[PDB]
């Protein structure tokens, strides 16, 4: 499941939008973007795979490593702590286009 990083490169993240160049099944490269906001939630300090507008309570979203997304999110105590999530869990590349599965 996911692992889009095996056939995609030059991945970048700005705010909640993931943008990356992926290879097509029939050869050739395709570029696309998808809003992860509809699939990431903030649970008492940690980002989880569920819709809830996480960026509304999180800031400094940035790309970490090859497939990890690092950000800071508010805990119930109203404090920003370091949080992270593996994009490889559900973000896959189907025909050069990214699709959550």
From Swiss-Prot:
Further facts: Its activity in situ is unknown, however it acts as a viral entry inhibitor, inhibiting HIV-1, HIV-2 and simian immunodeficiency virus (and some other viruses such as feline immunodeficiency virus, measles virus and human herpesvirus) infection and replication. It prevents essential interactions between the envelope glycoprotein and target cell receptors by binding to carbohydrates on viral protein gp120 and possibly by other mechanisms as well. Addition to cells must occur before or shortly after virus addition.
UniProt keyword terms in alphabetical order: Antiviral protein, Disulfide bond, Lectin
Family classification: Belongs to the cyanovirin-N family.
Subunit (UniProt): In solution exists as a metastable domain-swapped homodimer which very slowly converts into a more stable monomeric form at room temperature. Under physiological conditions it is unlikely that the dimeric species exists and indeed the monomer is more active against HIV. Interacts with HIV-1 gp120.
SMART domains, per database record: CVNH
Function: Mannose-binding lectin.
Domain of life: Bacteria
Organism: Nostoc ellipsosporum
Disulfide bonds: 8-22, 58-73
GO molecular function per UniProt: carbohydrate binding
One Gene Ontology biological process: regulation of defense response to virus
InterPro entries (alphabetical): Cyanovirin-N (IPR011058), Cyanovirin-N_sf (IPR036673)
Effect of residue 30 to A/Q/V: Prevents N-glycosylation upon overexpression in yeast without changing anti-HIV activity
Usage in biotechnology: Overexpression of this protein to provide quantities adequate for medical use as a topical microbiocide has been attempted in a number of systems including E.coli, Lactobacillus jensenii, the yeast Pichia pastoris and Nicotiana tabacum; see PubMed:20162270 for a review.
Effect on the protein of changing residue 52 to P: Protein is exclusively dimeric and has moderate anti-HIV activity
PTM comment text: Cleavage, or reduction and alkylation of the disulfide bonds results in the loss of anti-HIV activity.
Designated name of the protein: Cyanovirin-N
């Amino acid at each position: 499941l996911g692992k889009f990083s095996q056939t995609c490169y030059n991945s970048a993240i700005q705010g909640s939008v993931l943008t990356s160049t992926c290879e097509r099944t029939n050869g050739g490269y395709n570029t696309s973007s998808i809003d992860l906001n509809s699939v990431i939630e903030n649970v008492d300090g940690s980002l989880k795979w569920q819709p809830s507008n996480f960026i509304e309570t999180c800031r400094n979203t940035q790309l970490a490593g090859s497939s990890e997304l690092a950000a800071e999110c508010k805990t119930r105590a109203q404090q920003f702590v370091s949080t992270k999530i593996n994009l490889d869990d559900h973000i896959a590349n189907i025909d050069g286009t990214l699709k959550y599965e």
